[PDB]
Amino acid sequence: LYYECDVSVHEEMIADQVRTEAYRLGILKNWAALRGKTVLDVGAGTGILSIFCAQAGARRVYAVEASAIWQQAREVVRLNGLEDRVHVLPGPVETVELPERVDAIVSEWMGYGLLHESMLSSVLHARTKWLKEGGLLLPASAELFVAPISDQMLEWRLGFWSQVKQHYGVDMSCMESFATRCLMGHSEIVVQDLSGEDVLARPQRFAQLELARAGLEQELEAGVGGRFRCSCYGSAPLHGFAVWFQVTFPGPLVLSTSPLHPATHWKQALLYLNEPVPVEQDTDISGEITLLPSPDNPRRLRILLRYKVGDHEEKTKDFAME
Amino acid sequence: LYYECDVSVHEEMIADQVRTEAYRLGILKNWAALRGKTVLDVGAGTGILSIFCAQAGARRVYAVEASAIWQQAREVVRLNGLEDRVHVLPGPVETVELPERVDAIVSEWMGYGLLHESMLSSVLHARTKWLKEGGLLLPASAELFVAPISDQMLEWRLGFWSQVKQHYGVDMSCMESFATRCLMGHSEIVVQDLSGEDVLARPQRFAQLELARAGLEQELEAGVGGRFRCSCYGSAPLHGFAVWFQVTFPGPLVLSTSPLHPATHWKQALLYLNEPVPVEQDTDISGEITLLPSPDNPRRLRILLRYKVGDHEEKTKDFAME
Numbered sequence: 001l002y003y004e005c006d007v008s009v010h011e012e013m014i015a016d017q018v019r020t021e022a023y024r025l026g027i028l029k030n031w032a033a034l035r036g037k038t039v040l041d042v043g044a045g046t047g048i049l050s051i052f053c054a055q056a057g058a059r060r061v062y063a064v065e066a067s068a069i070w071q072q073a074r075e076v077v078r079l080n081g082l083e084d085r086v087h088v089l090p091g092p093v094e095t096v097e098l099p100e101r102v103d104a105i106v107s108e109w110m111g112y113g114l115l116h117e118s119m120l121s122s123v124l125h126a127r128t129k130w131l132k133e134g135g136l137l138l139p140a141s142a143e144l145f146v147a148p149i150s151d152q153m154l155e156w157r158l159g160f161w162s163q164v165k166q167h168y169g170v171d172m173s174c175m176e177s178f179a180t181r182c183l184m185g186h187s188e189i190v191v192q193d194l195s196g197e198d199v200l201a202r203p204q205r206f207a208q209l210e211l212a213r214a215g216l217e218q219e220l221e222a223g224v225g226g227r228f229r230c231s232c233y234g235s236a237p238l239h240g241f242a243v244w245f246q247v248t249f250p251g252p253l254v255l256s257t258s259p260l261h262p263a264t265h266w267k268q269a270l271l272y273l274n275e276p277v278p279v280e281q282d283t284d285i286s287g288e289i290t291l292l293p294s295p296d297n298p299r300r301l302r303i304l305l306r307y308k309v310g311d312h313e314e315k316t317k318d319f320a321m322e
Numbered sequence: 323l324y325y326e327c328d329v330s331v332h333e334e335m336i337a338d339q340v341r342t343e344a345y346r347l348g349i350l351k352n353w354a355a356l357r358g359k360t361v362l363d364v365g366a367g368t369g370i371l372s373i374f375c376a377q378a379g380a381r382r383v384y385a386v387e388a389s390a391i392w393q394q395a396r397e398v399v400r401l402n403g404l405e406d407r408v409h410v411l412p413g414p415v416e417t418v419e420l421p422e423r424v425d426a427i428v429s430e431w432m433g434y435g436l437l438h439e440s441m442l443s444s445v446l447h448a449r450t451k452w453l454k455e456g457g458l459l460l461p462a463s464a465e466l467f468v469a470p471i472s473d474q475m476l477e478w479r480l481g482f483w484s485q486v487k488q489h490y491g492v493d494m495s496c497m498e499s500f501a502t503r504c505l506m507g508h509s510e511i512v513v514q515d516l517s518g519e520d521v522l523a524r525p526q527r528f529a530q531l532e533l534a535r536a537g538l539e540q541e542l543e544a545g546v547g548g549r550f551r552c553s554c555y556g557s558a559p560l561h562g563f564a565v566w567f568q569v570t571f572p573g574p575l576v577l578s579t580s581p582l583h584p585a586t587h588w589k590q591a592l593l594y595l596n597e598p599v600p601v602e603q604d605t606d607i608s609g610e611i612t613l614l615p616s617p618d619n620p621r622r623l624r625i626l627l628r629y630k631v632g633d634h635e636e637k638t639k640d641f642a643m644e
């Protein structure tokens with residue numbers, strides 16, 4: 001028979017050793033809080049975090065998964081001999097029925113640019129509905145970072161047209177303005193992995209989310225973000241900004257998606273200006289970044305960028321996730 | 323302003339040094355036929371082949387391009403000082419009006435699996451309508467190859483689930499049958515680049531197309547292809563077959579897309595069986611491959627595969643391009 005199933009997303013998560021080991025160890029570090037306790041895994045996928053929770057000593061784990069992949073999690077649980085302690089429940093966590101309130105929620109809820117897919121809202125729904133007073137959330141907090149970037153790959157792609165003459169004897173340097181309009185003259189957030197070679201100033205933390213804190217659900221609807229200021233390291237074409245995040249598992253173990261840190265499947269969310277802007281050492285850059293639900297679709301990330309480069313006037317660019 | 327323009331396809335072609343240099347040199351090698359003559363470039367894109375033709379001494383080149391990219395070709399022609407000899411004409415070659423019949427047609431018409439996009443039909447339309455008797459077609463011929471494959475990347479992806487236990491202490495080996503159904507249990511042609519590490523038997527030429535030959539247009543409609551037979555090199559999981567092509571520029575310069583030869587942007591067209599089949603040294607494999615227009619859409623490649631592995635019965639699998 002023929003099927004159509006998608007599977008690349010799950011292989012990307014398990015092949016992400018930074019992601020998977022950070023959760024394994026973040027859960028294990030909370031052994032004392034989890035031993036003999038009950039856990040809700042929100043969006044359990046193929047089930048690995050629920051098993052990690054049982055291996056940290058959880059008495060009972062409720063693995064709630066809305067997509068079709070829940071059946072694989074049920075088989076994974078059985079293969080590991082845990083069917084009597086880890087229960088896989090299909091459907092959205094907003095309507096699942098558990099037999100009891102839980103001592104802890106674990107969830108891999110982060111999307112691209114942290115909030116693309118808006119899954120944090122389901123975790124917070126579950127916290128209100130099912131988490132006992134003073135219960136544990138894993139991870140417990142998230143931080144958002146921004147840095148100006150000179151994207152070396154983008155620089156190469158754009159300049160390559162002016163290199164055609166040296167390789168084939170045909171001048172194509174006019175394709176560079178065309179490529180710039182196509183590659184930068186759009187308002188889509190681009191998900192791409194960078195390295196420190198791309199980072200043009202010290203990264204700035206622009207927001208911090210404590211997931212258990214009162215009022216976070218309303219802050220997500222109104223926009224998460226803040227102002228930033230930095231000074232460029234040296235002369236380069238500024239292509240725009242990268243946004244990334246970290247989350248923290250309390251003891252604290254930090255899972256980072258910085259381009260300065262080991263690569264992860266989340267990569268970074270890139271906010272390209274309409275064209276490159278030349279900067280120099282100590283060029284001041286300031287701005288404000290706000291992460292928002294899209295009006296059409298609360299699960300599609302919108303990012304509003306306000307930015308000022310050196311002496312140029314402040315500009316605004318309103319992005320939505322690709 | 324914001325635009326939406328796609329550009330990755332053109333940067334892929336120019337970054338393909340095998341493709342671009344083979345055309346540059348294939349055209350230059352035909353200097354004697356082209357000097358002081360007229361040329362039609364079918365599907366001129368950003369225009370580089372038309373300029374190569376002028377640099378080989380063509381008197382006049384008609385660069386016909388249907389897509390929006392024709393305007394960039396006009397600018398490229400002007401940047402190279404050739405506006406008086408290379409004329410860029412927008413629209414389909416089937417309805418363009420040239421002022422004269424031409425001495426030669428050059429075209430980069432090959433798609434994935436050679437015939438995906440069915441552009442060869444436009445070249446042959448132009449040959450009938452505009453090419454002088456005894457005129458030159460560049461390239462002049464194409465050949466199609468098939469080989470059984472053991473796709474090492476696919477093998478890794480499928481087996482990785484049984485490796486999760488050794489890295490995280492959670493058994494996920496049941497995800498392997500799920501991944502196999504998702505990655506192989508479909509009827510899509512998959513475009514992927516292989517190497518000789520993937521090739522499981524001597525590649526077999528199964529068809530040859532002389533582009534100037536009578537009756538080729540009807541052969542494209544009825545199906546291009548043929549039978550093949552080979553003997554496996556050694557023990558491996560057979561995952562199916564790769565199809566690739568070469569084209570020849572007469573003097574002869576061969577542009578090959580074999581996995582044994584330098585990589586190109588055409589990669590190879592992979593025909594996966596529904597699940598891996600174990601083979602051994604000297605396991606005989608035979609079959610038949612036919613490249614067809616899809617019934618819904620003549621520009622989408624269909625491939626009908628008949629195959630017999632060792633003592634197993636002959637099987638059939640009907641693929642269409644992803």
Ligand SMILES: Nc1ncnc2c1ncn2[C@@H]1O[C@H](CSCC[C@H](N)C(=O)O)[C@@H](O)[C@H]1O
Nearest residue numbers: 043044045046048065066067092093108122
């Ligand atoms: N409201 C909701 N209720 C239950 N599951 C949800 C949900 N929203 C998203 N999901 C699921 O949450 C998962 C997030 S990816 C997390 C994957 C999981 N930790 C694993 O190891 O595979 C996805 O599988 C998605 O289907």
Ligand SMILES: Nc1ncnc2c1ncn2[C@@H]1O[C@H](CSCC[C@H](N)C(=O)O)[C@@H](O)[C@H]1O
Nearest residue numbers: 365366367368370387388389414415430444
């Ligand atoms: N019937 C037709 N008439 C004119 N152009 C066509 C065509 N069918 C396809 N094309 C064009 O043929 C091109 C094939 S890709 C060839 C690209 C070109 N040699 C370059 O150097 O860029 C595409 O640009 C496509 O738009």
